[PDB]
Amino acid sequence: VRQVSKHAFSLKQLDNPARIPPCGWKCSKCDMRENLWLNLTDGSILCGRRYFDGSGGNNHAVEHYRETGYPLAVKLGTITPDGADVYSYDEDDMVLDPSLAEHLSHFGIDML
Ligand SMILES: O=C(O)CCc1nnc(-c2ccccc2)o1
Ligand SMILES: [Zn+2]
Structure with a gap:
């Protein structure tokens, strides 16, 4: 079973985040579009x-x-x-982030 990450509750998220799109990403260091x-x-x-x-x-x-x-x-x-x-x-x-919704909203991601 995935356990709660000890980092999840008080994770730092930097100001002025990018808006992360819902598709079409690439590795910023290489050609990978998978993984x-x-x-x-x-x-x-x-x-x-x-x-x-x-x-x-x-x-x-x-x-x-x-x-x-x-x-x-x-x-x-x-x-x-x-x-x-x-x-x-x-x-x-692999871990559970009980604040995942909040963490993704930071980046303009609505998981719902
Ligand atoms: O590849 C990355 O940089 C980040 C993802 C990742 N690195 N290791 C694993 C892993 C380790 C144990 C169990 C399941 C997956 O996943
Ligand atoms: Zn890469």
Whole structure:
């Protein structure tokens, strides 16, 4: 089961966020249009890790986490009225963000 992230309740979200569109995103560091993560602190849009089997992205989201320490990201294309896929770099797991609606509203995302 996905547990509540310890970061969720008091997550920092930076002022002057981008309006994140409902489709058509790309990694800001490469050509990936699949497997994109929206960082819930800064609204960066970056691709997922390269898996050891050769699958996945080009590690741009994790590289960004190593620089910023911003732990929570939502997988774009998984946001629905029932929730979303939220990952914590810090806890290294998929997690629950009980403030997800609020976190997404920051970026002009109405999950409903
Ligand atoms: O790829 C990224 O940068 C962010 C998403 C991500 N990194 N690792 C995982 C993971 C780890 C444990 C369980 C399930 C998924 O997901
Ligand atoms: Zn990338």
